[PDB]
Amino acid sequence: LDSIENRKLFEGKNGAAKIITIVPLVNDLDPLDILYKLLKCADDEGIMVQESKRIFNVHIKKFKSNLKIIIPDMTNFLNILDCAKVADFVVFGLSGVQEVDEEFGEQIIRALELQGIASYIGVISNLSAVHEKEKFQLDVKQSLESYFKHFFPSEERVYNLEKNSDALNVLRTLCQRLPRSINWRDNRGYVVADFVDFVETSPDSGDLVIEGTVRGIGFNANRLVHIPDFGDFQLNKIEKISESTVFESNMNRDTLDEYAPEGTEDWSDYDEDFELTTARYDDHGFLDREFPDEIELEPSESAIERLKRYRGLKNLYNCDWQVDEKDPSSPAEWKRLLRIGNYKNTKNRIIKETKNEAQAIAGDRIRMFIRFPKFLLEKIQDPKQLLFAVYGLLLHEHKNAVVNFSLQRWEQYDKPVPSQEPIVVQYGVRRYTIQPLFSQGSNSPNNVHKYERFLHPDTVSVATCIAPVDFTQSPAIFFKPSPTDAKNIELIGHGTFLNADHSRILAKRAILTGHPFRFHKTVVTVRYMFFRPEDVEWFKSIPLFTKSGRSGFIKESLGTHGYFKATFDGLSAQDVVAMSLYKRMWPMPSLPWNG
């Protein structure tokens, strides 16, 4: 009972700011018409919009509450998403004449829902164009209502802005009804800039002043800040405006370092240094998919040199594979990454620390001085036209680490997706061009997982890469920018930022194909596997298997052309002799994404 009074206060007084985003899901639907029909309900004529251009601050006197209306750039799909993630309420605009495009309008409903929506409302301003008779118009309104309920059953009736009865009910909801909270946005800080100015300090960099009201967890002078399509930046000063305090950047401020100082690799020896006449074999445990992992050796090149970093495994679930081991293939950044022991506990601690050590709480008007470089000012667009939102970053969020994303294919995405090709990933407001190693999610004791070359279509897979830490487990949207597509991007998949564990070891499989030709009572001769007698001698330790379900071992080399004799438990001139080998796959560093 007490909690309801405290939660209302920030928005139910002369110092409130309610973010409302107008999202018309149809090509031939104007957002200004949707706004005019919504602002018509209030008796104050001086509220009405003509020629602020897209982002307006309107004070509705009928419900004694300030409203902040945002109109996105419909040419850019990502801008529509950007305006909605900052919104407290989203006004979806449906058309009576034109149907919602599956490739664009429908995809907006899909993408906004997957990145996180605070509150939604169905609205029709195009009902007049259908018919003159109310019997024909209501049949169209009911048809749109069934479509809107299919995406989310939270809304039962799609309000029509034509009738003053339904339009007054919408404004009453946008002004009085408390909006829902978005986990990642509200646990961070978020300020929608009303006015942006710049102060020169040096001929290279200065201070970018942002005036706005704090929403979410709040802001701290030491904590880093993030401007979308610009990057992460450090703060210098923050001024609090109160109706009848200044917080400065300390010695304990966060650094803009992506990786640890060059030399950190020399201060820790968690390395399994390994030194042989026979190839490596790990037998610690108890004993479509084959085709993509199959490999074929070249006759000129030796298999010892090619498959040097490969290990034979009796069982991948029980093998003693180790993290941080000595390997030349491993990235240089590996030791310079953020190593989090227990993500679950570090995530809760930083969140609790941020809320408790917050300087400018939600509802406070602030003047944010951001240490900004002068060269980036040419890309800054008017805050009244294009949404200028500043999202606060938690402790060590800038720092890169071995991050794990859960990812499921976007509905009706039959196209394949390989596990090394660059894909843009939007986790929260941040977006980076990620090269993700896919692996099927499993509860293995050794945390060793088989590296899948392509995204599995039946279930949800796990993408592993090197990217900065997200301490809010923000939902992730995976896309590839397409120029041929209506919306400048081609949405690949959706998911969530799982954790930041390096303990997840990924192993690439290599299956050697071999064909038997000669058959003695016990001695079976295979030929298409190796092409050197030395190569046969080296891989002798790794047991052989057959696609028919037989098991065996290499006896010795026959000729100088890699022919070999082998003994099996059960095969003919039609069976395929095979050998499975495994190598460690290291995560790949990712670059940021703007525009």
Numbering used by the authors: 67 to 117, 120 to 312, 335 to 365, 369 to 380, 479 to 761, 763 to 787
Give passages from the manuscript.
Twenty-S rRNA accumulation 1 (Tsr1) is an essential 40S subunit biogenesis factor with homology to characterized GTPases. However, Tsr1 lacks all the conserved motifs required for guanine nucleotide binding and GTP hydrolysis, and is therefore a structural mimic of translational GTPases rather than a functional enzyme. Since Tsr1 is not catalytically active these data suggest that, rather than acting as a molecular switch, Tsr1 is a molecular gatekeeper that must be removed before key sites can be accessed to catalyse the final stages of pre-40S maturation.
We reasoned that this segment might hinder crystallization, so we generated a ‘loop-out' mutant (Tsr1Δloop), in which residues 410–476 of Tsr1 were replaced with a short glycine- and serine-rich sequence. We found that Tsr1ΔNΔloop complements loss of wild-type Tsr1 in yeast, showing that the N terminus and acidic loop are dispensable for Tsr1 function in vivo. Comparison of the four molecules in the asymmetric unit shows only limited differences between them (root mean squared deviation (r.m.s.d.) values range from 0.9 to 1.1 Å) suggesting that the overall domain arrangement of Tsr1 is fixed. Domain II has a large insertion segment that wraps around the centre of the molecule. Comparison of Tsr1 with EF-Tu shows that Tsr1 has a domain arrangement similar to EF-Tu in its GTP-bound, active form.
